[PDB]
Structure 1
Amino acid sequence: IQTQQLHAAMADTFLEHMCRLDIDSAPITARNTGIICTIGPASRSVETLKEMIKSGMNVARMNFSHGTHEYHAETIKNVRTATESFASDPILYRPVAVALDTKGPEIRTGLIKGSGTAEVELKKGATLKITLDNAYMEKCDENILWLDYKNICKVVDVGSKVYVDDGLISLQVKQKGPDFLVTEVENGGFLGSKKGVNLPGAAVDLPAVSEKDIQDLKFGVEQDVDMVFASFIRKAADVHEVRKILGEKGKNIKIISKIENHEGVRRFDEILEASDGIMVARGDLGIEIPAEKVFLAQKMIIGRCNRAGKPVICATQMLESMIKKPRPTRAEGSDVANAVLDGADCIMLSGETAKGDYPLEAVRMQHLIAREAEAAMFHRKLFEELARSSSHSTDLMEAMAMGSVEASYKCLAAALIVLTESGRSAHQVARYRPRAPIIAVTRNHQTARQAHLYRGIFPVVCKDPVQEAWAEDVDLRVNLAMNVGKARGFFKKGDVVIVLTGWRPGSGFTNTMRVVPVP
Structure 2
Amino acid sequence: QQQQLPAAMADTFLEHLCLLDIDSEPVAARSTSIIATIGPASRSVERLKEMIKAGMNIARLNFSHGSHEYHAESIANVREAVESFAGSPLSYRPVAIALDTKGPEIRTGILESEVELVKGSQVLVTVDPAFRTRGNANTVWVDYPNIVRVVPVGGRIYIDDGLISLVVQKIGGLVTQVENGGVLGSRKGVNLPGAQVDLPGLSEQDVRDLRFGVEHGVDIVFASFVRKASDVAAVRAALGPEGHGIKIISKIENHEGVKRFDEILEVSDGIMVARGDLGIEIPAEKVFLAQKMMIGRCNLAGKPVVCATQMLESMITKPRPTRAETSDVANAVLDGADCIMLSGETAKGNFPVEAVKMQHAIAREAEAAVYHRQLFEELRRAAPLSRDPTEVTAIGAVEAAFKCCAAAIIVLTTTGRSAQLLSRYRPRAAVIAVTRSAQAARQVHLCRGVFPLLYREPPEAIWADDVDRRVQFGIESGKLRGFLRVGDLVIVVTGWRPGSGYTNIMRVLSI
Q: Matched residue of 1:183: which SS?
A: strand
Structure 1 spans left out of the alignment, 5+ residues: none
Structure 2 partner of 1:136? 131
How far 1:29 sits from its partner (Å)? 4.7
Q: Does 1:372 align with 2:365?
A: yes
**Of 484, 495, 500, which residue of structure 2 is paired with 1:491?**
484
How far 1:130 sits from its partner (Å)? 1.2
How far 1:224 sits from its partner (Å)? 0.5
> Counterparts in 2 of 1:114-193, with a 5 A limit?
117-177=112-172, 180-193=173-186
Structure 2 partner of 1:222? 215
Structure 1 partner of 2:423? 430
CA distance in 2, matches of 1:280, 1:312: 7
> Could you tell me whether the CA contact under 8 Å between 2:26 and 2:364 is conserved in 1?
yes
Cα deviations by residue, 1:393-422 (Å, 9 ceiling, x for unpaired): 333211111110111111000001001111
Structure 2 partner of 1:414? 407
Question: Aligned residues: percent identity?
Answer: 70
- Aligned residue identity for 2:285: E
Q: Matched residue of 1:11: which SS?
A: coil
Q: Matched residue of 1:511: which SS?
A: strand
CA distance in 2, matches of 1:103, 1:507: 34
> Could you tell me whether the CA contact under 8 Å between 2:107 and 2:189 is conserved in 1?
yes
Q: Matched residue of 1:449: which SS?
A: helix
- Aligned residue identity for 2:343: S
Q: Matched residue of 2:390: which SS?
A: helix
CA distance in 2, matches of 1:314, 1:457: 18
How far 1:497 sits from its partner (Å)? 0.6
- Aligned residue identity for 2:192: L
CA distance in 2, matches of 1:392, 1:82: 44
Deviates more, 1:384-393 or 1:309-318: 384-393
Q: Does 1:320 align with 2:313?
A: yes
Structure 1 partner of 2:65? 66
> Could you tell me whether the CA contact under 8 Å between 1:498 and 1:516 is conserved in 2?
yes
**Of 399, 404, 411, which residue of structure 1 is paired with 2:397?**
404
How far 1:136 sits from its partner (Å)? 1.9
> Could you tell me whether the CA contact under 8 Å between 1:29 and 1:489 is conserved in 2?
no
Structure 2 partner of 1:234? 227
- Aligned residue identity for 1:307: L
How far 1:390 sits from its partner (Å)? 1.0
CA distance in 2, matches of 1:166, 1:416: 45
CA distance in 1, matches of 2:205, 2:64: 10
> Could you tell me whether the CA contact under 8 Å between 1:111 and 1:139 is conserved in 2?
yes
> Could you tell me whether the CA contact under 8 Å between 1:421 and 1:447 is conserved in 2?
yes
How far 1:134 sits from its partner (Å)? 2.3
Q: Matched residue of 1:217: which SS?
A: helix
Structure 1 partner of 2:110? 111
Cα deviations by residue, 1:440-483 (Å, 9 ceiling, x for unpaired): 00011111010101000000011001111122111110110111
Structure 2 partner of 1:294? 287
- Aligned residue identity for 1:271: I
> Could you tell me whether the CA contact under 8 Å between 1:258 and 1:280 is conserved in 2?
yes
Q: Does 1:202 align with 2:202?
A: no
When normalised by structure 1's length, the TM-score is 0.97
CA distance in 1, matches of 2:462, 2:135: 73
Q: Matched residue of 2:233: which SS?
A: helix
Cα deviations by residue, 1:170-214 (Å, 9 ceiling, x for unpaired): 11110111xx11111111111111111000001010111100000
CA distance in 2, matches of 1:459, 1:248: 26
How far 1:506 sits from its partner (Å)? 5.2
How far 1:509 sits from its partner (Å)? 2.8
- Aligned residue identity for 1:420: T
How far 1:135 sits from its partner (Å)? 2.0
- Aligned residue identity for 1:159: G
CA distance in 2, matches of 1:508, 1:298: 33
CA distance in 2, matches of 1:200, 1:135: 26
CA distance in 2, matches of 1:350, 1:193: 24
Q: Matched residue of 1:422: which SS?
A: coil
Residues 508 and 393 of structure 1: CA distance in aligned 2, closer, same or farther (over 3 Å)? closer
Deviates more, 1:278-287 or 1:382-391: 382-391
CA distance in 2, matches of 1:507, 1:269: 28
> Could you tell me whether the CA contact under 8 Å between 1:425 and 1:509 is conserved in 2?
no
> Could you tell me whether the CA contact under 8 Å between 1:100 and 1:227 is conserved in 2?
yes
When normalised by structure 2's length, the TM-score is 0.99
- Aligned residue identity for 1:149: Y
Q: Does 1:81 align with 2:80?
A: yes
CA distance in 2, matches of 1:213, 1:505: 38
- Aligned residue identity for 2:301: A
CA distance in 1, matches of 2:165, 2:308: 25
How far 1:138 sits from its partner (Å)? 1.1
CA distance in 2, matches of 1:444, 1:186: 54
Structure 1 partner of 2:95? 96
For the aligned residue pairs, the C-alpha RMSD in angstroms reads 0.9
Q: Does 1:517 align with 2:510?
A: yes
Deviates more, 1:120-129 or 1:271-280: 120-129
> Could you tell me whether the CA contact under 8 Å between 2:28 and 2:429 is conserved in 1?
no
- Equivalent pairs counted in the alignment come to 511
CA distance in 1, matches of 2:416, 2:470: 14
> Could you tell me whether the CA contact under 8 Å between 1:27 and 1:371 is conserved in 2?
yes
CA distance in 2, matches of 1:164, 1:503: 58
> Counterparts in 2 of 1:256-335, with a 5 A limit?
256-335=249-328
CA distance in 2, matches of 1:389, 1:486: 35
How far 1:392 sits from its partner (Å)? 3.6
CA distance in 2, matches of 1:30, 1:130: 53
CA distance in 1, matches of 2:498, 2:251: 38
How far 1:511 sits from its partner (Å)? 1.2
CA distance in 2, matches of 1:210, 1:83: 31
CA distance in 2, matches of 1:486, 1:19: 34
> Counterparts in 2 of 1:436-451, with a 5 A limit?
436-451=429-444
Structure 2 spans left out of the alignment, 5+ residues: none
> Could you tell me whether the CA contact under 8 Å between 2:28 and 2:430 is conserved in 1?
no
> Could you tell me whether the CA contact under 8 Å between 2:319 and 2:351 is conserved in 1?
yes
Q: Matched residue of 2:106: which SS?
A: coil
